[PDB]
């Protein structure tokens with residue numbers, strides 16, 4: 001099974017028996033994809049254990065996998081487990097079950113539903129400032145993924161359930177404590193190492209009631225939703241019930257995906273943005289000059305005022321270029337196809353290296369440098385939407401893209417209106433990415449906060 | 453009563469006595485709303501006779517009228533008469549009668565009931581192609597609304613009653629096309645407006661706007677169609693608190709809407725596809741990709757076609773067949789920072805908002821890329837309202853969108869459309885009452 005790409009004439013690193021090419025992950029998925037992109041070119045193949053993975057970098061071929069042949073061939077992602085009841089999660093569901101859940105949860109993030117969240121999100125933006133004002137009036141360096149994480153959890157628990165959990169913190173809020181340990185794919189752990197190298201034990205662990213998400217975390221989330229479901233305004237929890245009037249299980253599964261996504265992805269990218277704004281004070285000042293122009297006298301940010309800020313979107317877009325927290329896009333080829341003049345066998349996992357494409361010198365000038373001017377309307381036209389895919393593409397893209405982009409901008413504004421950010425020497429410069437599994441910094445992002 | 457907007461400080465054209473502002477309708481409702489939107493920015497008021505009409509364009513205020521305070525203040529549309537037994541129609545009913553009829557007729561267009569209609573609709577799509585193949589093998593220019601209307605009547609009479617009607621000269625299409633034509637030159641719907649206080653006279657006089665020998669003919673056909681689950685069956689089960697009349701009133705609305713709205717928009721779409729062959733070809737390339745070897749369109753393959761939805765959405769932007777949205781303010785309110793008196797008709801100029809330069813780049817041009825997933829997030833759902841919004845929105849929106857798409861697929865799979873010189877280019881909209889072309893849409897049909 002390790003002679004598939006040798007047969008197809010597709011280059012790639014020589015796989016070791018059983019392991020495949022997983023030993024090359026010692027520097028992370030990023031550095032492995034960047035090296036393979038330069039070593040073999042537009043298309044290469046490798047093996048995660050006994051599983052062949054074909055990597056494509058052609059925009060037309062990426063457009064075919066993500067959009068053109070999504071419903072017919074490239075519908076599902078790589079099988080993930082053991083998940084237990086989480087198999088019904090929208091990000092894990094396959095084929096028919098995903099198509100029903102995608103249409104059920106699509107009206108959650110419309111332009112109207114999002115516009116209803118702006119007055120609600122505006123509350124915790126002040127709690128975010130008041131919590132930062134305490135750590136700013138006393139010169140105390142600030143870890144950001146904590147103060148950004150507490151704000152993100154308050155938004156997702158209210159925009160989707162209408163409940164207030166962290167009521168001004170409450171820094172040991174149980175949701176944030178449990179959600180931060182819902183899952184950390186560490187390749188050092190021999191669990192996830194075996195899960196990939198040896199994939200036939202997943203049915204063993206499924207009947208063994210084993211779950212990658214710790215039982216103490218799922219329970220706390222499983223019983224909180226049953227606590228949140230007691231008897232409106234029409235949000236994520238409401239859409240599921242009015243159509244349930246689904247099950248008590250699949251309803252909990254989708255809530256866990258929304259709670260994690262709204263917390264981890266929002267807080268991590270916000271920490272990546274503030275690091276770039278601190279290391280580039282010229283960009284931070286120019287961004288502060290635009291916020292004061294659209295919103296004078298520290299005016300509260302509204303739905304339309306956020307979409308007007310051109311430079312705020314450029315800072316968000318450039319940071320998502322350097323740090324695509326998804327790293328990769330994966331689709332499982334469900335049947336034999338010949339896309340763009342290339343045969344792809346059934347079962348092959350088609351992977352799009354987003355991190356490698358976002359830093360390809362053949363597309364970006366000085367790819368390692370933070371330059372928000374890449375996304376200006378003077379130059380945003382010179383960017384392929386299939387090379388820069390921070391939220392994916394096609395029918396199975398990021399469903400909370402418009403919500404995540406709005407909320408992050410609502411937090412950036414209401415912060416940069418009151419504070420400027422400076423490094424602290426105890427701040428890691430340059431920022432090392434996590435050489436482990438997920439895209440995070442090695443040392444947590446710390447920065448000095450000064451009040452304006 | 454002509455100093456209401458002068459009192460409230462709301463701008464608007466100076467009304468003439470009795471007439472009000474109706475003599476500005478000489479260019480149509482659409483050109484009157486576009487001019488008033490540019491001169492009387494954001495909010496303006498005018499009079500349809502002695503009836504004050506407040507026009508709003510703010511998305512937050514439109515959302516408040518159509519959605520938030522719909523059940524409480526803005527529940528009913530403008531009063532219309534004389535109507536007779538048609539007062540029990542869902543689109544004419546008011547307050548309690550509408551709420552019961554809206555809940556009664558809503559399950560007609562669920563995702564399951566619509567999915568049941570695809571195998572039935574797929575029959576007349578072949579008859580639509582076979583009737584077009586005769587007028588295509590001979591080089592005869594085709595009147596699109598004629599061949600599109602015969603298909604629309606077959607669908608509504610089977611999806612709602614289960615009867616097969618159109619095989620040429622069909623009595624249903626012939627009568628339904630005459631059911632109502634609001635012509636402002638025509639002096640009845642006119643005086644009805646300048647003089648709305650004689651509507652009661654003609655009521656106790658048994659008089660109506662829909663021709664007697666059109667209503668009778670629809671009135672006896674339903675009694676003929678009722679002999680022993682669809683739109684018809686849903687009501688007889690609640691009759692066994694509908695009556696032998698209110699059931700007939702709802703059937704007339706479903707038959708008219710399923711015929712005129714479907715055929716007219718389908719004609720508007722094929723005109724834009726013939727005047728923009730690049731969009732027509734690009735749409736044909738997507739249909740052959742989702743449905744290879746001319747595969748029959750099913751429920752799921754229709755919702756997959758992204759470009760087909762973008763073409764339908766852009767055509768509905770340029771030609772919103774309803775033109776306006778109207779709600780009657782039933783009690784004094786102060787919405788979004790503006791006082792509105794009781795009895796004022798709140799109007800949303802859909803045609804004017806769909807072509808507003810503060811919202812659309814080159815609004816007069818046909819660009820389906822406005823509704824691509826990349827850009828459709830620039831579109832306010834309260835500016836682009838081809839089916840309205842709120843609890844009293846278009847109840848047959850999901851049915852009309854599938855039916856038109858099911859017809860566009862089967863037609864574009866077999867034929868390409870070209871102008872015929874005798875085709876009106878550019879297309880003039882009807883300067884009269886309803887949104888239609890002046891000259892009928894004629895195009896050349898070539899077989900692939």
Ligand code: HEM
Pocket residue numbers: 066090091092102257258261262265266269320324325326329330389390391392393394395396397398399400401403404405
């Ligand atoms: C900076 C913030 C975020 C980024 C960069 C991001 C990125 C992504 C990407 C790249 C994908 C996969 C797309 C593909 O495979 O083509 C994805 C999927 C998904 N995202 Fe996000 N996301 C973010 C925030 C959020 C938020 C706030 C939510 C809230 C619910 C969310 C929910 C989801 C879900 C449910 C999926 C799976 C969709 C499916 O399988 O159909 N994401 N995200």
Ligand code: HEM
Pocket residue numbers: 542543544554705706709710713714717768773774777778837838839840841842843844845846847848849851852
């Ligand atoms: C392209 C096709 C169509 C368009 C653009 C359209 C548009 C509209 C609009 C704008 C309204 C007014 C909504 C409001 O005032 O908020 C409406 C109402 C209505 N439509 Fe249509 N429509 C179409 C086809 C149909 C079809 C096929 C039916 C089949 C039954 C239908 C039945 C109705 C009914 C019954 C109402 C009144 C609902 C009520 O008053 O509660 N329409 N439509």
Ligand SMILES: CC(C)(C)OC(=O)N[C@H](CS[C@H](Cc1ccccc1)C(=O)NCCCc1cccnc1)Cc1c[nH]c2ccccc12
Pocket residue numbers: 077078080089091092182183185257260261265326327328329330398437438
């Ligand atoms: C490399 C690792 C093992 C880390 O992840 C995977 O391999 N597990 C998925 C298959 S289920 C996945 C399971 C999950 C649930 C909660 C927290 C974390 C993990 C899931 O539910 N995820 C969406 C959760 C919320 C979210 C996150 C980020 C952005 N938006 C929303 C496959 C996958 C690999 N990379 C991806 C990038 C995007 C989407 C899916 C994947």
Ligand SMILES: CC(C)(C)OC(=O)N[C@H](CS[C@H](Cc1ccccc1)C(=O)NCCCc1cccnc1)Cc1c[nH]c2ccccc12
Pocket residue numbers: 529530532541542543544631632634704705706708709713774776778846885
């Ligand atoms: C400018 C004029 C006077 C022409 O029209 C109005 O002012 N009279 C209505 C108040 S009753 C209206 C009466 C009616 C009934 C059958 C056929 C035609 C007319 C009615 O029931 N029509 C719905 C029939 C089904 C349908 C048609 C089109 C699209 N979808 C469904 C006010 C009104 C203005 N625009 C509208 C759009 C939809 C519904 C009502 C209105």
